[PDB]
Amino acid sequence: LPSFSSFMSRVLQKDAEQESQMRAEIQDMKQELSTVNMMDEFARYARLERKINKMTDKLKTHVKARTAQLAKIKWVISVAFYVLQAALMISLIWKYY
Amino acid sequence: RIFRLVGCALLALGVRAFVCKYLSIFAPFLTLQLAYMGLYKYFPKSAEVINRSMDTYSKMGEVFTDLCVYFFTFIFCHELLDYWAADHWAWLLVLSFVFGCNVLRILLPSFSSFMSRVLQKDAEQESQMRAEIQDMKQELSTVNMMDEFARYARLERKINKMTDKLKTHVKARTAQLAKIKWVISVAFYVLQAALMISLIWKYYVAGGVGITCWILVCNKVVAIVLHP
Amino acid sequence: PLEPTLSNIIEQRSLKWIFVGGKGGVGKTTCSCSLAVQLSKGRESVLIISTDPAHNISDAFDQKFSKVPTKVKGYDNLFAMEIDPSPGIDEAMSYAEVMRLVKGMNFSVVVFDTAPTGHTLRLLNFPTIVERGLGRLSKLEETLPVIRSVSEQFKDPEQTTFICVCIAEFLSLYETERLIQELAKCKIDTHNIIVNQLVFPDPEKPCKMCEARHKIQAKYLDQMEDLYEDFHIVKLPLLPHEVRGADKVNTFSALLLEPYKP
Amino acid sequence: PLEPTLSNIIEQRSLKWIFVGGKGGVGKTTCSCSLAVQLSKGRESVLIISTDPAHNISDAFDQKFSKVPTKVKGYDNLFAMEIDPSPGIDEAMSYAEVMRLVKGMNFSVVVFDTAPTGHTLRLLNFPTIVERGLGRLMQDQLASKLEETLPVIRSVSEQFKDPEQTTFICVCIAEFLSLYETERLIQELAKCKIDTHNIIVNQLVFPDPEKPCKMCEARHKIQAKYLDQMEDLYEDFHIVKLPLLPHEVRGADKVNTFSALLLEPYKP
Ligand SMILES: [Zn+2]
């Protein structure tokens, strides 16, 4: 488990870079928004929420799909685990025979 | 998918019909030729490592079923001949055993329904509560806003109040009975594990694995067929 | 920038469903009946359907109505109706009966008037989901087609459309923004934001509050334009409290063809 | 019946936090400024705060300010403040910092101008949660920081739920949507158990037959109806109406006139 987690993270570093930079700028402009008047700039302000929503929801659904394939990799490692029980099973089999 | 299964069922029937007759020394080879028939038949009808893994699990499950089914075929063409010792009672007893274990894993919902002894006294109150909240909202629906905000808000706060009262009551009950069922479940669970260890000591290697085969490889299939 | 006339909504055949929306002290019934009266001219026969529990169609049209769709006094093709009937199955069956009786008349355009809280077609999508789960495990089958039909009817960006209606106040503006986003999320189409209660003063009136609000509302209206150049805009000046009734409806609906000139 | 003036607030000596809230185009900053200018007279020293991003205090006073209290010309007790940055530990740290500095320097009363989007009182619920966690988890500079916050946070919390030293002023306008908003707001506050006795209204037209203008009576009737159903539904809470002011005078003069009108009951 720890070893595999190390490998998955080391390959998933591309995701861990992109998600980081994205959310980073996200808060950057969220703070910008917080410094935007709600009476003389509502138009640009509205462009900004629409942008935030599009970015967030799209990448977020992407995250659902990524975590889906991730749980598929947990199910193939669970198959690997079931192979390790079959392994130790044949081990006792030969310990007898 | 179901048709291939009943096909292997008729295969099993043929195996019972003639394998024990022992016309030749061919039992395992005929086993694996009948298996090849279906194995090949799959293709006409029908990343890379992922595709293999899904199939491997499916085939292992089916073969394990079929292989031990071939063993059952030696257990029935000869049971009639017995009528034509202690061992045949020993086979019969594990039938009862596993009927009991699975009627209790299906009895667990009976305990869920048995919670209704106190859930009746709960239901009467909660149901009356609902009755009032629904009629209050239905009357609320017949109220305008621009000229009747006063009555609107009056009813809204009344409903919302009784509503939150009801949610809290129901949540408490559910969040109580849930642990109750969890604990009674683990309880009889370790009691069937106790029954297994009991039979294991009663028969204190081939026999043990065989027992496991009869209690699972077959029964779980029967359960998925009759009470999926 | 487009033009301040509803030429598109009038000059189109494929439309069959028009939905009007908007909270606040907005004359939803007034603008509904207005669009209906104008649309009727070009079209063949128009069936107005209310949902607001205030039934202001009765007020504006001085006749009594019921769950039966009926004719309209002083008119030829105008047709009115209203249903307050607008666990989770009997509501869906009532709505299915409604839509069946609608298809039976098969009116070219069935304009609605949504109520104070939200939109009635967001709700309709719930029964199908639960229905499919129930099937997984009679009347529901029959019911199914009469619904998938109108579901395509609605998902089409060419046969149905939305017309939100707003007042020149920041709260209503933010609300209408939220509404437009929620709609575009739920995959409907839209092209129209009527504004309403527009004052139009002149120097003949030395009133100063009428100029303070004038500048405020003006400024807001222009910020409104900036953010909606894509969509059309429909200026629609506030009418005196003098005339109320058929007089009003006629006069008011006249504005939805030519731009207003004070 | 119930006095249309703010006598209770102006007369009470245990007040320490006077929140002001309410969405819409209302000039809540101006109303709070007026309340402060009036409160200072009888009391000893009043410290305004602010959280709106528009910094309306600036345009209302023609002075610059920063993250540090500061005197304002023509007043000996009014001190201005604003906080534009206003993890979770460091958020609590910044809030604790402002609380300690605002309260230590012999300040009898603190006035807030909450933003028109959200609510920050409820925040305190997050700390107390953490507190339970801290003991339960056990059973350097961060541990010391946590120690210096929880007693302070929990101490500053009781003055708020206390109905005799913390007071909320919602403000709304006479129109449906805003009325319903300030309704739901009152209900949610009463749920979170915070005292409240006062609903200022604003932008009130007051016409006379001298003006043959028709809209001035159409809105007038509208305002009448709404204001009266509002009274009916809030007879308990004090109602203190304020007239709309013309655009000629903007500045200290409008501040002191609103102040007078809030002190004494309005009559045209
Ligand atoms: Zn006027």
Numbering used by the authors:
A (entry chain C): 1028 to 1124
B (entry chain D): 189 to 234, 254 to 291, 1005 to 1124, 1149 to 1172
C (entry chain B): 23 to 108, 140 to 190, 220 to 344
D (entry chain A): 23 to 108, 140 to 192, 216 to 344
Please share text taken word for word from the publication where this structure appeared:
The eukaryotic guided entry of tail-anchored proteins (GET) pathway mediates the biogenesis of tail-anchored (TA) membrane proteins at the endoplasmic reticulum.
As previously for the sequence with native helix α3’ (referred to henceforth as ‘wild type’), a heterodimeric fusion with the flexible N-terminus of Get2 truncated (hsGet2ΔN/Δα3’-Get1) was purified and complexed with apo hsGet3. Superimposition of hsGet3 between the wild type and Δα3’ complexes highlights a twist in their respective interactions with the hsGet1-CD, with the coiled-coils being rotated and tilted by ~15o between structures. Instead, the N-terminus of hsGet2Δα3’ TMD3 abuts hsGet1 TMD2 of the opposite heterodimer, burying a surface area of 190 Å2.
